[PDB]
Design a protein around this ligand. Structure first.
Ligand SMILES: *[C@@H]1O[C@H](CO)[C@@H](O)[C@H](O)[C@H]1NC(C)=O
Lengths: 438, 49
């Protein structure tokens, strides 16, 4: 049989339900969302890391001429200079009365440390959510893991179970992101082929070990200015360390709902938000006919004591009369309250307690023992402790915090002035006629 | 758990109380003031004889 139900997106929050079929005892169904797995689609754009300038041996043409030539190396620079003043420990490298000239050039390349200090700029889209569900029926536990989509049931025992789509779409990830040393940072990285000195991603490459590179970081050559042969180079500070210094806090400290983000899939997990509708198919053989089910008689409830606690602290008791030994389930069709155990033994005239929780102080509702129903009411008090991180609000508040006494007072407050005005008008018209008599 | 109660100053007078907690049986609490000890601060002034 197939049953439909909506569940909150949250871990460690079992949800209990029942299936009604004529001649079959209502079957307890427990559903647990073990964890969440939001995996988006992303594409590798480029990589960046601290670089190193190249300072190759300059070219010296003595007492003659020469011309500059470009080079395919990324961020390359070249420039000639006449009237050079070459000196070295060995002395004047060559000789002519200041006629000689020298060509200098430089370029950049990623340093060896980059191999492990690389930071990759990622473009992401189409967040996809994966949900793992564990379902208990007839004290039998089955499992499945399915994409949140409502069109691809998973495989578990060759059982087709579907979930979603989500009520709302949530994704902490933004279109542009960066990954560095296992830390993910939300930032609008410059597009590939865009070089801006003193900025993130100044050096860009298709792959870490790509021979072809493109970069621009405003390198300007300086004229020789000293005795010896030297190439003074002026360049802006590397942008990688710049972004490192003031990169801001990591996404791990900014993700809403406490998403637990992992890097190797670049995906979130254990993050709770939204609702999920699901349809569960259960084999008919799993069901049990009511003929063999225990029969109960003259059952009654009693709230020994309840507390309006965030955690599961509510208690209840039931007393029953029966004729057959065995087990029956227990349920509460009121969403405001949730039980703890789904089934229990049954005796001829036994009475058993129950643990439960509620989201309202007016503990009035209907609970079913085995197949039969029964009303049960009480009032609950706020707790002394008022800060706890354990599961809370298994059912969200439904403006039911208002008390029965509050309803009685509000009813006694509003007055029936409409009846007063109606009676006044009626007597007024009657008197008007009586005086039209004259 | 913490509970507040007022007791008379007197020996050999047990006082009984209960603590109410949801889902917990009320726990009997007996309190006895075995004795009193009023100790003041004093300073030696001098001696005579
Ligand atoms: C499940 O509950 C039924 C109901 O009494 C019982 O007969 C059966 O033995 C239970 N299964 C297990 C594995 O305990």
């Amino acid at each position: 049989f197939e049953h439909a139900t909506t569940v909150p997106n949250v871990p460690g929050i079992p949800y209990k339900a029942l299936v009604e079929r004529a001649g079959y005892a209502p079957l307890n169904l427990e559903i647990t969302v073990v964890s969440s797995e939001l995996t988006p689609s992303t594409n590798k754009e480029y990589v960046t890391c601290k670089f190193h300038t190249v300072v190759p041996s300059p070219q010296v043409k003595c007492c003659g001429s020469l011309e500059c030539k470009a080079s395919s190396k990324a961020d390359y620079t070249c420039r000639v200079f006449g009237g050079v003043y070459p000196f070295m420990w060995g002395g004047a490298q060559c000789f002519c009365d200041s006629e000689n000239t020298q060509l200098s050039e430089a370029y950049v390349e990623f340093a060896p440390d980059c191999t492990i200090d690389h930071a990759v700029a990622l473009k992401v889209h189409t967040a996809a959510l994966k949900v793992g569900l564990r379902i208990v029926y007839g004290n039998t536990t089955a499992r499945l893991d399915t994409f949140v989509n409502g069109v691809t049931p998973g495989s578990s025992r060759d059982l087709k179970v579907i979930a979603g789509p989500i009520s709302a779409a949530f994704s902490p990830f933004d279109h542009k992101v960066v990954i560095r040393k296992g830390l993910v940072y939300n930032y609008d990285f410059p597009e590939y082929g865009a070089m801006n000195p003193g900025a993130f991603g100044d050096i860009q490459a298709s792959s870490l070990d790509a021979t072809d590179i493109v970069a621009r970081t405003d390198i300007r050559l300086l004229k020789p200015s000293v005795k010896n042969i030297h190439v003074p180079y002026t360049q802006a500070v590397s942008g990688y360390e710049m972004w490192k210094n003031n990169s801001g806090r990591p996404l791990q400290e900014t993700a809403p709902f406490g998403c637990k983000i992992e890097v190797e899939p670049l995906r979130a997990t254990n993050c709770a938000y939204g609702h999920i509708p699901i349809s569960i198919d259960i084999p008919d053989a799993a069901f049990v006919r009511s003929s063999e089910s225990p029969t109960i008689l003259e059952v009654s409830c009693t709230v020994a004591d309840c507390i309006y606690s965030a955690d599961f602290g509510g208690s209840l008791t039931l007393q029953y009369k029966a004729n057959r030994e065995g087990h029956c389930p227990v349920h509460s069709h009121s969403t405001t309250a949730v039980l703890k155990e789904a089934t229990t033994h049954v005796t001829a005239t036994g009475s058993i307690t129950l643990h439960f929780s509620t989201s309202s102080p007016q503990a009035n509702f209907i609970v079913s023992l085995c197949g039969k129903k029964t009303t049960c009411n009480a009032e609950c008090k706020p707790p002394a402790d008022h800060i706890i991180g354990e599961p809370h609000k298994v059912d969200q508040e439904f403006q039911a915090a208002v008390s029965k006494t509050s309803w009685n007072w509000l009813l006694a407050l509003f007055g029936g002035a409409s009846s007063l005005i109606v009676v006044g008008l009626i007597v007024l018209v009657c008197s008007s006629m009586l005086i039209n008599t004259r």
